[PDB]
Amino acid sequence: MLIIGERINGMFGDIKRAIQERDPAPVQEWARRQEEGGARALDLNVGDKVSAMEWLVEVTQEVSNLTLCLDSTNIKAIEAGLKKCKNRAMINSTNAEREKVEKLFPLAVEHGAALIGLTMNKTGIPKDSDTRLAFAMELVAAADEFGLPMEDLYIDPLILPANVAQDHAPEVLKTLQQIKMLADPAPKTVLGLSNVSQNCQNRPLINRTFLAMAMACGLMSAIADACDEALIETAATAEILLNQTVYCDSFVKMFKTR
Amino acid sequence: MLIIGERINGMFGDIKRAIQERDPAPVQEWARRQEEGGARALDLNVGDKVSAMEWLVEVTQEVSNLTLCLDSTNIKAIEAGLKKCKNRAMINSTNAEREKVEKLFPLAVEHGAALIGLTMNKTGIPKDSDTRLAFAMELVAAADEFGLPMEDLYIDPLILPANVAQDHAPEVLKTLQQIKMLADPAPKTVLGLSNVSQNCQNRPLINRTFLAMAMACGLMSAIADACDEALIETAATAEILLNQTVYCDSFVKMFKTR
Numbered sequence: 001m002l003i004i005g006e007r008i009n010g011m012f013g014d015i016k017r018a019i020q021e022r023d024p025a026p027v028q029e030w031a032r033r034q035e036e037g038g039a040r041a042l043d044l045n046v047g048d049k050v051s052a053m054e055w056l057v058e059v060t061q062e063v064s065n066l067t068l069c070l071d072s073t074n075i076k077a078i079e080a081g082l083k084k085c086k087n088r089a090m091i092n093s094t095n096a097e098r099e100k101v102e103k104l105f106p107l108a109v110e111h112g113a114a115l116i117g118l119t120m121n122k123t124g125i126p127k128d129s130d131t132r133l134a135f136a137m138e139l140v141a142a143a144d145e146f147g148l149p150m151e152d153l154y155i156d157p158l159i160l161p162a163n164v165a166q167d168h169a170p171e172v173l174k175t176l177q178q179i180k181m182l183a184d185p186a187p188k189t190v191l192g193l194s195n196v197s198q199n200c201q202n203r204p205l206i207n208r209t210f211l212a213m214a215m216a217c218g219l220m221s222a223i224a225d226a227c228d229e230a231l232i233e234t235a236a237t238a239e240i241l242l243n244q245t246v247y248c249d250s251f252v253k254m255f256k257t258r
Numbered sequence: 259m260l261i262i263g264e265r266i267n268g269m270f271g272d273i274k275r276a277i278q279e280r281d282p283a284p285v286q287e288w289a290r291r292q293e294e295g296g297a298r299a300l301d302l303n304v305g306d307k308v309s310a311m312e313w314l315v316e317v318t319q320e321v322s323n324l325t326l327c328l329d330s331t332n333i334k335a336i337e338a339g340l341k342k343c344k345n346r347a348m349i350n351s352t353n354a355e356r357e358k359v360e361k362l363f364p365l366a367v368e369h370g371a372a373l374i375g376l377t378m379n380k381t382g383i384p385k386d387s388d389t390r391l392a393f394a395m396e397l398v399a400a401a402d403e404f405g406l407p408m409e410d411l412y413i414d415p416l417i418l419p420a421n422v423a424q425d426h427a428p429e430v431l432k433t434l435q436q437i438k439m440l441a442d443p444a445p446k447t448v449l450g451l452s453n454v455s456q457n458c459q460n461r462p463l464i465n466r467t468f469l470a471m472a473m474a475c476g477l478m479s480a481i482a483d484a485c486d487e488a489l490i491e492t493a494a495t496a497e498i499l500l501n502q503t504v505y506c507d508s509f510v511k512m513f514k515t516r
């Protein structure tokens with residue numbers, strides 16, 4: 001399970017200020033902590049988008065060798081950021097809109113980057129796992145067309161808050177399982193984990209419980225809170241239960257430090 | 259998720275003593291504590307099994323209206339225990355072996371009781387999920403043959419410790435998923451949850467991680483630590499995530515007190 005650390009996002013006030021002030025310290029500090037949590041990737045979200053992404057990339061990769069996950073709907077910004085990246089990167093994201101696909105799929109191929117794909121077009125987030133499924137298939141077909149390796153496509157079936165859209169959660173579990181049972185080579189799957197618990201009580205609880213359930217349906221990656229030690233515990237334990245990682249008594253520690 | 263409290267077992271010292279000494283005090287209080295945790299059924303294991311079981315029954319239902327889960331391979335103990343039951347109980351258990359099937363299914367029907375069937379025969383635990391399944395279909399057939407209501411049959415795919423039997427854990431996860439694919443309407447499923455962590459570090463974490471995972475794979479009930487508040491939390495939470503229980507703020511409280 002790949003944990004993509006969520007915290008370097010402009011929607012958080014300290015990051016918005018750091019970016020505005022062009023003060024790299026809060027950014028670099030969140031970079032170490034997330035990594036130290038056990039994240040093996042860093043989500044980067046400006047919250048001049050192109051320049052801000054650039055600074056985010058440079059400032060962050062100056063203290064961290066983690067895979068950088070460029071999080072923006074401005075494709076200019078991702079591209080600029082893609083250019084600044086010292087190592088392989090992830091793009092977050094494209095959806096199933098052909099206009100996006102023809103741009104971001106090749107874009108990803110140019111830079112040897114991973115690509116996250118939302119099971120949706122511009123119509124809106126689908127109400128069921130069938131409609132989701134059908135968007136994930138286009139994503140897959142898009143990969144083959146543009147020669148993006150299937151293991152480099154991360155499909156996001158889009159989880160929704162448990163309080164207002166409770167009926168979506170099992171529908172998302174179902175799509176994951178359907179994608180899991182795709183023929184070799186199969187694509188990967190990722191979630192925007194924290195959204196499952198948006199305005200709910202005991203968010204960390206909900207977050208980690210869905211993490212475990214989604215991994216059983218083959219979840220490969222999660223944008224999430226890397227400084228939630230209990231979430232990280234879940235991540236490492238789930239790996240063991242799926243016989244993805246060899247047991248030892250210190251499995252938690254091995255995950256955090258591997 | 260039906261939590262079957264594991265505590266009233268003769269493997270534990272205090273129950274071992276309270277039995278022989280025929281003191282119900284330790285038994286009754288554990289019955290109280292388990293229910294307090296949220297257990298809605300109660301395993302009763304002896305550790306004269308027959309008079310003992312009978313004792314466990316009478317003593318326990320002196321304080322609990324909770325379903326009694328009579329835990330023994332001594333059919334007379336079971337039979338002798340059913341008869342003393344004030345409420346509907348559950349038989350723990352039968353395997354796929356004819357000699358047992360022939361006996362334990364009519365038994366459970368006679369007393370209007372649920373039945374737990376292990377997906378094995380006398381030889382041993384099966385390796386894969388497809389061998390467990392076969393025993394599973396066999397169990398489904400007998401429920402029909404002997405007129406046991408399918409929702410009264412709880413099939414146990416038999417989970418093993420993760421440090422010594424890691425490859426079995428995903429196997430049980432698939433068996434759980436497929437088993438729902440076996441009939442309409444389907445039988446229920448059950449786990450001896452705590453067996454997954456038998457001699458591992460941080461057993462609770464492992465136990466409850468697997469619970470969530472198994473529940474995503476349709477797990478209906480589990481014999482486990484009802485006094486494990488984190489376990490109970492996970493049960494409560496996973497129900498919500500599957501849209502089995504209507505969301506609400508104090509959803510943990512609601513699972514405990516409903």
